[PDB]
Amino acid sequence: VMLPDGTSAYTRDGSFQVDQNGQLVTAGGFQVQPAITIPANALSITIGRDGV
Amino acid sequence: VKVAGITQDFTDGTTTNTGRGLDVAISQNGFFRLVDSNGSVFYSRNGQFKLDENRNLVNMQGMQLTGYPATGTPPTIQQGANPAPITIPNTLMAAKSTTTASMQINLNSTDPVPSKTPFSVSDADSYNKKGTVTVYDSQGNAHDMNVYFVKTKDNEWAVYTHDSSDPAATAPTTASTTLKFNENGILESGGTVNITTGTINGATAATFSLSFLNSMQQNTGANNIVATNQNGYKPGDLVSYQINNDGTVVGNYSNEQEQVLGQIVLANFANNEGLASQGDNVWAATQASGVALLGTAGSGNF
Amino acid sequence: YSNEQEQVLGQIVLANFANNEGLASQGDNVWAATQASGVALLGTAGSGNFGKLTNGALEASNVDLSKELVNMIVAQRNYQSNAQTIKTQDQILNTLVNL
Amino acid sequence: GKLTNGALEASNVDLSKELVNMIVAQRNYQSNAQTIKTQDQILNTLVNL
Amino acid sequence: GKLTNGALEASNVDLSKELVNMIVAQRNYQSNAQTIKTQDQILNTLVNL
Amino acid sequence: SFSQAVSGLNAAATNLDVIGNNIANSATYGFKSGTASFADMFAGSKVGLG
Amino acid sequence: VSVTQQGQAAPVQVGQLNLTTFMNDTGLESIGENLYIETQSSGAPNESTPGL
């Protein structure tokens, strides 16, 4: 997770949301380091055993 | 431990066949758009809709429903207009004069020329076919326009104009329209005719263009009219209103005329669980929710 | 009449409201117009917004016991479920009292 | 109206209409009894907490 | 009123009316007993200190 | 925290009263069936109030 | 506030019931009987209709 100051933290609890701009962020306003951008007009999000 | 903010699951519920006419449900993501008296805009998912003393689509608590306004003559939906309150007026519509009348007539190539050379309006054999066309004026009067087919020679038809609703109408004798078909009976040209009725009750006569397009004289045994259309309607009265699957509100009248009074707009947020609940089951847009991102109920993932 | 004569003593009026669900119930099977219900807007049964009548006939109660009994079971369970929330709210407070 | 000696009026009743209405009446009478039973249980849980 | 020879009159007591009235009466009594039960515990807590 | 539980009972009691009215009012020729409708309340945020 | 009367067929608008809002509600001085009186810490009230 990319902290607001600029460094990187690590978390274990996974419960994510979406910001107003479409980035996948955790509860609290912190974004994910790979910066997965969920596009608009989306029906559903699917995640397999891998990270895809 | 600190409470890190609650969240709401926005999975779709189960639809129930309540009945009624003023109740709708959304099978996927989408929120109805609501406004208060103060002008602020709220979003909700309540299907319960009712009218009020002002004949407006209002929720059960008293918030007006907003949607695409219907404007024009004839009124039509606009997808480039700002959201506006949806209203079913009780005002009666006025008559609209017929302007474009088109018919399709199938003629017989094996039809011999009628024996009587001079045209007659009081004898059926004088004309090959008779064609009654109802035309409405700007007052509502019905003009019983009669069109007569007469075949004079090979691959040639004489079309005349006659009106029955006018007691002062003059019996036609001369040729008003000449129709020539192709080698195979396909219509080529001369199918557009300007026909004007006669004034009655001090109302101006109805001027319209008569079309015989898509007509063939190939042998079909007997003359048969397969189509007849016009664009005039007498004044009507409000009877019933129905909501279709597209969100449009259509009111039925006496003359079976459909009048579109608007369609329901659906707003989809770029991110759910960012809406702040306000009193009853409505939500107000804020940060962590994005723009309204409006759209129609048909496509656009709504 | 006894002499092959027909007389008319009037016609029954019908009432349509611009907005239903505003007719406040008044004791017996009658309704009273008020706000959010529109004007009386009297009319005639002939044509328009008013339907046709039928001599020597009556309408049912539009109430079906099949749809009401099943809702009674659902409504009862929701009440008992709420009665569990208040009961567990007393015990959770009772533990905090003695402590 | 005119009379008729040696004639008498019937009871102007229909056995078929009354028999079928009997079945409907009984079910309605049992249906309300369910409301009483429901009201009994719904109040029993509250008094006993 | 007029009399009648060879007849008797019932008790004009309807079982259905009385039986349902017993159900509501019983629940009224139990509700009253709760106040005594509440009044006992509220007083028991105070004396125990 | 009885405010939410108390408000829940009133809704269910009202819902059962209307249902009891409809079943009792059967066979009444000039009668229209009724139905209740609820609506949640939110005073502030993050918590419900019944 | 409106009153439903017997022979008018419509409610009569008796009057308007506004309310006053302060910008320092915690600064009000409290007296008995659930009454607050305006003080110096609390600002001058500005009466308004509900919803505005």
Side-chain angles (χ1 to χ4, degrees):
Chain A
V1 165
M2 172 68 164
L3 285 184
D5 55 350
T7 175
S8 300
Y10 303 88
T11 184
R12 183 58 182 273
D13 184 11
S15 60
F16 308 97
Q17 293 182 357
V18 189
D19 70 330
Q20 56 177 337
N21 311 275
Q23 280 72 12
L24 184 65
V25 304
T26 181
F30 301 144
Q31 73 175 13
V32 189
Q33 182 63 25
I36 313 300
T37 299
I38 293 294
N41 56 90
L43 298 185
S44 57
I45 294 89
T46 63
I47 306 177
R49 271 76 66 89
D50 301 4
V52 288
Chain B
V1 53
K2 158 176 59 60
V3 183
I6 81 165
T7 172
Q8 310 196 30
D9 180 14
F10 282 97
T11 46
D12 188 6
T14 52
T15 64
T16 66
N17 292 331
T18 301
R20 293 186 52 182
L22 265 64
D23 58 321
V24 284
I26 311 97
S27 306
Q28 294 84 5
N29 40 14
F31 299 81
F32 292 136
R33 196 174 186 271
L34 294 181
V35 298
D36 313 327
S37 65
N38 309 333
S40 59
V41 174
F42 285 165
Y43 305 89
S44 70
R45 294 182 60 99
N46 264 350
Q48 295 280 19
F49 285 146
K50 69 170 185 179
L51 301 90
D52 55 356
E53 191 176 357
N54 304 129
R55 301 301 302 272
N56 306 331
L57 266 301
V58 190
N59 77 322
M60 193 49 63
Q61 279 67 16
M63 269 61 65
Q64 302 182 8
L65 181 59
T66 52
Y68 288 143
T71 56
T73 51
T76 184
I77 198 63
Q78 177 70 13
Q79 297 188 359
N82 47 11
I86 170 183
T87 290
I88 301 182
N90 198 18
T91 309
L92 315 178
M93 65 177 180
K96 193 258 290 181
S97 302
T98 303
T99 65
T100 304
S102 66
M103 309 79 59
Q104 306 189 55
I105 298 91
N106 209 129
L107 302 167
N108 304 128
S109 62
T110 54
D111 179 68
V113 185
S115 179
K116 279 196 170 184
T117 43
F119 177 76
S120 179
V121 77
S122 300
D123 211 0
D125 57 359
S126 174
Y127 49 87
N128 292 117
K129 194 58 179 179
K130 179 190 304 176
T132 70
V133 174
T134 302
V135 172
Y136 302 87
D137 60 334
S138 296
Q139 179 190 4
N141 310 276
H143 302 264
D144 188 5
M145 289 304 305
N146 303 305
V147 168
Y148 300 152
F149 279 94
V150 178
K151 182 183 175 184
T152 63
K153 62 185 64 61
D154 307 328
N155 300 332
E156 161 60 29
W157 301 86
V159 169
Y160 308 147
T161 165
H162 189 20
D163 198 329
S164 178
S165 63
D166 305 330
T170 304
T173 308
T174 61
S176 181
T177 299
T178 285
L179 292 185
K180 289 189 179 62
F181 295 94
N182 204 22
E183 178 187 348
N184 300 25
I186 303 180
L187 188 57
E188 181 175 5
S189 57
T192 59
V193 186
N194 298 332
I195 300 293
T196 296
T197 66
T199 170
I200 49 182
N201 303 124
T204 59
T207 57
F208 55 91
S209 62
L210 204 63
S211 178
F212 294 82
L213 189 143
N214 196 30
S215 173
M216 302 177 182
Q217 68 170 2
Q218 307 171 9
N219 176 35
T220 181
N223 300 327
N224 300 124
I225 302 180
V226 294
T228 299
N229 183 23
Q230 47 83 18
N231 58 326
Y233 48 84
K234 54 181 170 299
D237 46 359
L238 187 58
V239 172
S240 60
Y241 36 82
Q242 189 272 349
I243 289 184
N244 303 269
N245 56 339
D246 58 359
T248 60
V249 280
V250 185
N252 296 337
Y253 299 93
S254 302
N255 47 13
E256 308 299 329
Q257 282 290 343
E258 321 295 330
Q259 183 81 316
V260 175
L261 307 176
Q263 78 171 15
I264 310 303
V265 297
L266 300 191
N268 195 329
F269 286 81
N271 151 79
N272 298 119
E273 71 265 355
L275 310 182
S277 54
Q278 304 296 331
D280 53 323
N281 41 17
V282 306
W283 293 294
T286 178
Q287 292 291 345
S289 64
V291 306
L293 191 59
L294 305 94
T296 178
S299 181
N301 97 96
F302 300 94
Chain C
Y1 281 88
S2 309
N3 45 1
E4 280 277 0
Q5 307 307 316
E6 309 289 340
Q7 297 185 24
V8 282
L9 302 92
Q11 187 175 19
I12 184 70
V13 301
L14 300 195
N16 267 342
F17 293 89
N19 170 35
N20 292 125
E21 292 85 23
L23 311 181
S25 299
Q26 292 297 322
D28 45 357
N29 30 18
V30 300
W31 289 282
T34 177
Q35 295 286 339
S37 62
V39 301
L41 218 175
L42 74 158
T44 316
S47 295
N49 196 20
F50 311 89
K52 295 220 309 173
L53 316 183
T54 296
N55 306 337
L58 285 173
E59 69 282 19
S61 54
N62 76 92
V63 170
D64 45 338
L65 306 180
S66 298
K67 263 60 177 180
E68 295 292 341
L69 289 179
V70 290
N71 291 332
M72 182 169 300
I73 294 182
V74 175
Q76 177 184 357
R77 295 306 170 188
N78 291 265
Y79 194 104
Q80 293 181 4
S81 297
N82 289 337
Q84 298 299 324
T85 304
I86 180 180
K87 185 170 66 178
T88 192
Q89 201 64 40
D90 194 8
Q91 299 181 5
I92 189 186
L93 187 61
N94 177 82
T95 298
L96 197 57
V97 171
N98 314 119
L99 205 43
Chain D
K2 306 298 182 297
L3 306 183
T4 301
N5 41 18
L8 292 177
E9 182 188 359
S11 52
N12 67 265
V13 297
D14 188 1
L15 71 163
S16 62
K17 183 178 179 180
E18 301 303 328
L19 256 296
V20 296
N21 288 330
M22 172 66 59
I23 304 304
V24 177
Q26 173 190 358
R27 297 301 175 181
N28 182 23
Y29 176 77
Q30 290 177 0
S31 299
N32 286 274
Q34 303 292 345
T35 301
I36 290 295
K37 183 178 179 180
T38 298
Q39 290 284 3
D40 184 14
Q41 297 175 1
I42 197 192
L43 190 49
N44 177 87
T45 170
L46 192 51
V47 53
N48 296 13
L49 183 58
Chain E
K2 60 179 181 180
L3 295 188
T4 300
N5 186 20
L8 285 179
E9 54 278 35
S11 59
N12 72 268
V13 172
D14 180 81
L15 291 180
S16 61
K17 288 179 60 62
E18 299 304 322
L19 284 182
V20 297
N21 286 334
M22 187 181 59
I23 300 183
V24 297
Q26 178 186 7
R27 297 307 172 182
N28 292 9
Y29 192 101
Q30 291 186 353
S31 296
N32 296 18
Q34 292 297 329
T35 306
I36 293 180
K37 183 175 182 177
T38 294
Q39 189 67 19
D40 187 16
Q41 296 178 350
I42 192 182
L43 184 56
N44 172 35
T45 303
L46 189 51
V47 56
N48 292 325
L49 187 61
Chain F
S1 172
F2 295 91
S3 63
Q4 306 173 359
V6 164
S7 62
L9 297 182
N10 299 343
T14 298
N15 200 326
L16 266 182
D17 288 334
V18 175
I19 291 181
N21 177 35
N22 291 266
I23 178 180
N25 267 316
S26 175
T28 301
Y29 296 102
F31 181 79
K32 300 305 177 181
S33 174
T35 300
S37 298
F38 316 103
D40 56 335
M41 66 163 69
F42 274 86
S45 183
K46 287 167 45 58
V47 284
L49 283 84
Chain G
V1 47
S2 57
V3 165
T4 63
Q5 212 159 12
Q6 171 266 357
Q8 278 68 24
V12 284
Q13 211 280 345
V14 174
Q16 177 58 38
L17 183 57
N18 323 274
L19 43 83
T20 68
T21 164
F22 306 93
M23 51 89 60
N24 196 337
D25 302 332
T26 169
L28 291 167
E29 170 181 341
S30 62
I31 67 180
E33 298 287 336
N34 279 328
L35 300 186
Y36 306 152
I37 68 181
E38 171 185 353
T39 174
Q40 188 184 8
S41 72
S42 173
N46 38 17
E47 174 175 345
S48 63
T49 65
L52 281 70

